[PDB]
């Protein structure tokens, strides 16, 4: 019984649910799930780096399930026609290794991203936001507006990429979503001026300043999700030092995230320890928070969860025989050996 | 993506024949084993529960990433379940695309009799005829043959707890006229004069299912059992008296026997054996013991002779894990109208 949901499935699932709700749900499981933060045992991503780019494995697991991806990044995909990010993952019983359920989760990546930003957003911005920046136009870029847009009330979005052709995709791709307007800025210091939020998703594996020093404004919000990898980030230090910064899981995010850039000692704040009103959050409204995102297995674990339960209830999902189930004589592997 | 699931590999390995299967991997596996030093190796990740564990074991060179995921639960056979059940992908390194996914439940035991295989060859006694055989389960069938189609084994007197294994063991492999499996009523006596002693029990514990008394002089120590902190086969005193043998040191100070030994204690590295470097067994009175755990560079290996063989028949199913080329790489909104849309 190890259920498959493969591309074309899963975007009949995020069809019907909507793109909308299934952030909106999976922000909400999330939200959860980072309260239960001491209950899973958690690791780094263990990352074998390449030339132009690295594959990861993201485990994760509690006392019940277990549950990992695996996930690349290669910004010079898109050069070769291919996405960035490509990613699976598989959710298996803890007591007996089983794996219940194998998913593709590159489209469930970019929800489950879009859905832990807002999730720190709802709980370190300013509850008055309404105009984001948003730097970066690529794959994950209508996810995030859309989170945004129908979860934290952002009515304006200023987008701007290196390449226009993304900011038109973009623009045209959320058209239909008329409470919403977007508008290609010239440049980056263009885009994020005078905006309450600054969301960054740009792809280059290279340490980058995106946002420097002279673009912060007194009580912006800002969700770097772009960098995730040592050597690749979009903030210049000095703009993390002039903020109170957030974290998913410290020890993977000190050689991944925006934070590698200061020493081991810099100060920062874990989010799970703030959803559960156990530590400060915004401490005021002239502060700069950082949501120094870079991804987190438990993310995984709780999309994985989440799209299990719903294609479950819609009936989804193909069976495929990937390990061996129930058999008479388990201790009989050779019996296989005669042909099916 | 291409597919290989259980009953396709069940049909692969039918065609290529065990034995075959096992040599033609043994020979695989020494050539990248030689080149050891130009892998990205990592202790395997694993995620400890109260009945056994979950792991992830990847490995990659300059043009291929591979990853084994692979569970080991010695209760899950009281529930009709299988102790080990594991798949794998080999991936394109420069873009990250997943090229084949497959099973690896019957590859894990090919690709651990190939690797108990190819240390045998170079560190057991060149004339060994006789090896006893403790753990009759999963893994005995292909450690048997491996050791009697390429290793002259000609005997082996198996033993386990569960009788009926040793009768599956002994049924399965009737066939081979030119091998003799016989059941003893205990492990001391299973391993007296013999020639190779392989340990392939499952017990999530610390076990001395082999003791120095049974130690004899020549003797080669497949330990293939014990994969994991706290779970041995070997009492401690038994690799005090041999010359031990590695996969991957950092991994294997901290799964194998020899995590009952000082973090001093001297091992060799078998990929050094086999360029070489150092020797494997020195003398015809050494005990040479070959502390297996498992290392993801075999089943890259496996992975990687799989696709070939697979490739070569039109063997394997097409699926959709993940977007291949597209007009526009960075719309994948466009994927969330459904299907159709
Ligand atoms: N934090 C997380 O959890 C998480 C999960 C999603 C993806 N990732 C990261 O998010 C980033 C974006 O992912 P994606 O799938 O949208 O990639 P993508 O390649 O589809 O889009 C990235 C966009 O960034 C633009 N860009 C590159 N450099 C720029 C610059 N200096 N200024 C403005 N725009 C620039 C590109 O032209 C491109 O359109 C990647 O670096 C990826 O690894 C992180
Ligand atoms: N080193 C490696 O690369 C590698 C790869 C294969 C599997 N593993 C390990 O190999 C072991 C066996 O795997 P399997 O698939 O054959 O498992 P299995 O459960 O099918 O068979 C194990 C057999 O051991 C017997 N056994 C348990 N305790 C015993 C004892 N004290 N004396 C004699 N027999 C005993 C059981 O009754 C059983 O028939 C497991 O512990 C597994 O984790 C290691
Ligand atoms: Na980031
Ligand atoms: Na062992």
């Given at each position: 019984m190890t259920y498959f949901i493969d591309v074309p499935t899963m975007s009949d699932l995020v069809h019907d649910i909507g793109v909308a709700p299934f952030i909106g749900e999976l922000a909400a499981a999330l939200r959860d799930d980072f309260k239960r933060w001491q209950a899973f045992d958690k690791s780094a991503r263990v990352a074998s780096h390449?030339?132009?780019?690295?594959?990861?494995?993201?485990?994760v697991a509690d006392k019940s399930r277990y549950a990992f991806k695996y996930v690349n990044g290669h910004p010079?995909?898109?050069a070769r026609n291919l996405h960035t990010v490509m990613a699976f993952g598989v959710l298996a019983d803890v007591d007996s290794g089983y794996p219940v359920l194998l998913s593709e989760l590159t489209i469930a990546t970019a929800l489950r991203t879009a859905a832990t930003s807002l999730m720190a957003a709802q709980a370190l911005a300013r509850p008055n936001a309404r105009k984001m920046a948003?730097?970066?136009?690529?794959?994950?870029?209508?996810?995030?507006?859309?989170?945004?847009?129908?979860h934290l009330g952002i009515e304006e979005i200023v987008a701007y990429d290196t390449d226009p052709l993304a900011t038109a995709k973009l623009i045209a791709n959320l058209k239909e979503y008329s409470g919403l307007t977007i508008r290609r800025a010239?440049?980056?210091?263009?885009?994020?001026?005078?905006?309450?939020?600054?969301?960054?998703?740009?792809?280059?594996?290279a340490y980058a300043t995106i946002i420097t020093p002279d673009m912060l404004e007194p009580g912006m919000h800002l969700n770097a999700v772009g960098g995730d990898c040592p050597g690749k980030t979009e903030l210049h230090a000095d703009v993390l030092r002039n903020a109170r910064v957030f974290v998913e899981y410290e020890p993977q995010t000190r050689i991944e995230g925006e934070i590698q850039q200061l020493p081991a000692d810099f100060p920062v704040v874990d989010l799970w320890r703030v959803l559960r009103?156990?530590?400060?959050?915004?401490?005021?409204?002239?502060?700069?928070?950082?949501?120094?995102?870079?991804?987190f297995a438990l993310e995984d674990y709780t999309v994985?969860?989440?799209?299990?339960?719903?294609?479950e209830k819609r009936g989804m999902g193909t069976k495929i025989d990937l390990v061996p189930?129930?058999?008479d004589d388990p201790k009989d592997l050779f019996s296989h050996t005669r042909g099916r």
């Open positions: 390449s030339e132009v780019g690295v594959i990861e494995l993201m485990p010079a995909n898109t948003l730097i970066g136009n690529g794959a994950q870029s209508e996810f995030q507006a859309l989170a945004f847009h129908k010239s440049s980056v210091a263009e885009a994020v001026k005078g905006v309450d939020i600054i969301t960054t998703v740009t792809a280059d594996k009103g156990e530590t400060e959050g915004r401490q005021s409204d002239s502060q700069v928070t950082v949501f120094d995102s870079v991804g994985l969860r989440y799209v299990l339960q719903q294609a189930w129930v058999e």
